[PDB]
Amino acid sequence: GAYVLDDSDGLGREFDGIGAVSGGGATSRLLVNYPEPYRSEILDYLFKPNFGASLHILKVEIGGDGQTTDGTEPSHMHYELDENYFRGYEWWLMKEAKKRNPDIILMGLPWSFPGWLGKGFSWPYVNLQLTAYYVVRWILGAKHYHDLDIDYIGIWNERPFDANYIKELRKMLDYQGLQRVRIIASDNLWEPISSSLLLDQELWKVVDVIGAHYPGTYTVWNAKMSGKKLWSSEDFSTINSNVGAGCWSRILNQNYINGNMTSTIAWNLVASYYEELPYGRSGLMTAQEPWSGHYVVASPIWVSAHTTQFTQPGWYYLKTVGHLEKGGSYVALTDGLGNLTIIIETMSHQHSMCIRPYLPYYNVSHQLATFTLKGSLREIQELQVWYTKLGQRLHFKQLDTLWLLDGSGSFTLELEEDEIFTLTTLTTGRKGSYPPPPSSKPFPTNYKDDFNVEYPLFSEAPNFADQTGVFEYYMNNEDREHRFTLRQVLNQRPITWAADASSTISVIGDHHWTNMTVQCDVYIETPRSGGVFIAGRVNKGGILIRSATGVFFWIFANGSYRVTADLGGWITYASGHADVTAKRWYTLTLGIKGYFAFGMLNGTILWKNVRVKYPGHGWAAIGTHTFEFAQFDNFRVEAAR
Ligand SMILES: *[C@@H]1O[C@H](CO)[C@@H](O[C@@H]2O[C@H](CO)[C@@H](O[C@@H]3O[C@H](CO)[C@@H](O)[C@H](O)[C@@H]3O)[C@H](O)[C@H]2NC(C)=O)[C@H](O)[C@H]1NC(C)=O
Numbered sequence: 001g002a003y004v005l006d007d008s009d010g011l012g013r014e015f016d017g018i019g020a021v022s023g024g025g026a027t028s029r030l031l032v033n034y035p036e037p038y039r040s041e042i043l044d045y046l047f048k049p050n051f052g053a054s055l056h057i058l059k060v061e062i063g064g065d066g067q068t069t070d071g072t073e074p075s076h077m078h079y080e081l082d083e084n085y086f087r088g089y090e091w092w093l094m095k096e097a098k099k100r101n102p103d104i105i106l107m108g109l110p111w112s113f114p115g116w117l118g119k120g121f122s123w124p125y126v127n128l129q130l131t132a133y134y135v136v137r138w139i140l141g142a143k144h145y146h147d148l149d150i151d152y153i154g155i156w157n158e159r160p161f162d163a164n165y166i167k168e169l170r171k172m173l174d175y176q177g178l179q180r181v182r183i184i185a186s187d188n189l190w191e192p193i194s195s196s197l198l199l200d201q202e203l204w205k206v207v208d209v210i211g212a213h214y215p216g217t218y219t220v221w222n223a224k225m226s227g228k229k230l231w232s233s234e235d236f237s238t239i240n241s242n243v244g245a246g247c248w249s250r251i252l253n254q255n256y257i258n259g260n261m262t263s264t265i266a267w268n269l270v271a272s273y274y275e276e277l278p279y280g281r282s283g284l285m286t287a288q289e290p291w292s293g294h295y296v297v298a299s300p301i302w303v304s305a306h307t308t309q310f311t312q313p314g315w316y317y318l319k320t321v322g323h324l325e326k327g328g329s330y331v332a333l334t335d336g337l338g339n340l341t342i343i344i345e346t347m348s349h350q351h352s353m354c355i356r357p358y359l360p361y362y363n364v365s366h367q368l369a370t371f372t373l374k375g376s377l378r379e380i381q382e383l384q385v386w387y388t389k390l391g392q393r394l395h396f397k398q399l400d401t402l403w404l405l406d407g408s409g410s411f412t413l414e415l416e417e418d419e420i421f422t423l424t425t426l427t428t429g430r431k432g433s434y435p436p437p438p439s440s441k442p443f444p445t446n447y448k449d450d451f452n453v454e455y456p457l458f459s460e461a462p463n464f465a466d467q468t469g470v471f472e473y474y475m476n477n478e479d480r481e482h483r484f485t486l487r488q489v490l491n492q493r494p495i496t497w498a499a500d501a502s503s504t505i506s507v508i509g510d511h512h513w514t515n516m517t518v519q520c521d522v523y524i525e526t527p528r529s530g531g532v533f534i535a536g537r538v539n540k541g542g543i544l545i546r547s548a549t550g551v552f553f554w555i556f557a558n559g560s561y562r563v564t565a566d567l568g569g570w571i572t573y574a575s576g577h578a579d580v581t582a583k584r585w586y587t588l589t590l591g592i593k594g595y596f597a598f599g600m601l602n603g604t605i606l607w608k609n610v611r612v613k614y615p616g617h618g619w620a621a622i623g624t625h626t627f628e629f630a631q632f633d634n635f636r637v638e639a640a641r
Pocket residue numbers: 514515593594595640641
């Protein structure tokens with residue numbers, strides 16, 4: 001009915017920021033090859049202050065060469081004795097974010113690790129000092145090569161922690177003069193981390209934040225007892241339609257209200273991965289067409305604004321926050337300098353369903369809300385007003401100032417369903433705008449890449465999304481016909497997070513493609529036992545990469561060939577002998593039209609009119625039989641969608 005907002009009785013918990021994740025996995029893959037100015041606009045919509053999402057926090061995967069949801073991300077140590085601080089795009093992303101917001105808070109977390117850390121096991125805790133050394137090299141590198149200070153380091157995404165590891169990781173950070181860097185654990189459930197902290201003072205000393213995943217707005221008693229900052233360190237993961245923006249809006253408030261969480265971080269920052277990959281379009285905005293420049297500033301960018309443009313890490317929540325009588329919720333915060341921000345949400349059950357968890361139905365309906373400013377707040381007479389309505393929508397529209405000059409220090413609102421209001425003393429608010437970008441367009445139906453780039457800006461060719469193994473630009477001075485190629489660089493299975501395939505593979509193009517011709521030069525580096533393939537109609541990737549079907553055309557250095565229906569090689573379409581050895585350049589062609597396929601070795605037919613499942617559709621792809629060195633060159637694809 002009436003709700004009091006006051007601070008004379010003290011303050012709530014310190015606010016830590018709203019953020020998002022790049023990674024887990026390859027979520028930003030297709031953002032790096034956006035033409036300008038679009039790439040830069042997209043970044044502005046995410047990171048520029050007083051503009052778009054205006055994020056406070058950027059969390060990135062520390063790549064371990066394993067598949068980690070929508071692809072793999074390259075590690076800084078592929079092998080023992082390898083150190084390279086320039087692979088992939090997270091370094092870049094971090095720099096672009098610091099460019100726009102110098103005060104952005106940066107976080108790193110591993111999902112997978114290179115297999116060599118396991119010392120013969122797929123386990124990152126066999127040698128604690130080795131795994132810590134690995135993780136600490138990354139933090140050092142960020143600083144030494146990119147001038148990036150990493151503020152928070154995690155443990156092992158949604159996997160078990162080892163308390164001795166966390167202790168070692170702290171000792172190791174300190175030893176390298178990284179006392180400044182804080183530790184967040186365990187990026188999984190509230191337990192066993194929370195009880196672990198109450199039972200072990202030494203573990204308690206070295207963990208600074210409890211970050212939990214998909215908590216459904218709630219915490220647990222042990223976490224409250226710990227006195228640690230509590231964060232939803234990964235949340236959201238829902239299609240950025242109105243439903244998703246509704247989900248985001250509700251949990252932004254109710255994570256603090258119900259769960260005492262002082263930060264929430266969305267997976268993922270931006271949908272820059274093929275939509276047909278797992279959890280497609282579940283970023284705060286969409287940017288999945290570098291070939292066209294098309295991007296969508298989706299509802300969740302403006303939901304974010306309603307909190308980020310009007311708060312900063314270091315502000316405090318008030319004690320007075322809660323639910324509304326008739327549905328929805330409200331939080332309020334101050335900076336302790338006379339500024340006050342009020343964020344109100346009325347998301348209806350039906351337009352705010354998150355993927356994890358699903359909420360039993362709850363009611364929201366029209367209501368009036370009366371707010372009264374007691375304590376050091378009574379002295380406020382003017383408040384700027386921002387308003388969003390989800391579902392025909394209006395986004396982040398500024399409304400006329402509200403005045404409380406009567407001396408009541410009180411006002412009232414006509415709240416309805418699926419609305420958000422931000423009431424703030426701050427006047428910096430802005431609904432940033434660039435002109436609309438180009439219209440969406442399918443992936444090009446003729447496409448070529450000869451990999452001829454001597455100093456590439458990124459470590460991998462555009463549009464190729466690795467789903468097992470890691471493919472890289474490769475310069476080979478000692479050959480002149482193939483001096484610039486794409487090379488698969490893993491020589492052993494990673495300490496996996498997902499169920500990586502047994503074969504490496506990178507997918508590309510348009511998932512709708514159904515008739516297509518794929519050509520590529522391939523070179524097998526391993527004698528006797530090596531193998532490579534090219535494919536089309538590849539229908540699954542990411543988390544599901546093991547399930548992928550399609551038409552796979554393999555050659556091996558034992559003088560043989562197989563055509564399979566599946567990446568796992570279980571199902572045979574044709575197989576035979578071929579004049580193929582290791583360490584020789586061969587040109588593969590694969591043609592698939594309706595019910596039939598054919599392969600050519602070096603322009604000459606190897607197999608014709610082999611029957612294949614149809615209809616079927618999916619990407620094109622290149623890859624290798626195991627985790628083995630191989631090269632590709634002069635890639636082309638001609639497709640019909
Ligand atoms: C990919 O290739 C398949 C196979 O070529 C395409 O399906 C085929 O579509 C054609 C024409 O669109 C069908 O042609 C036939 O033409 C005669 C004469 O006018 C007509 O009387 C028949 O009823 C039929 O329309 C053909 O039957 C059909 N083949 C199969 C196996 O379904 C497909 O359109 C191609 N996909 C894309 C989008 O490029």
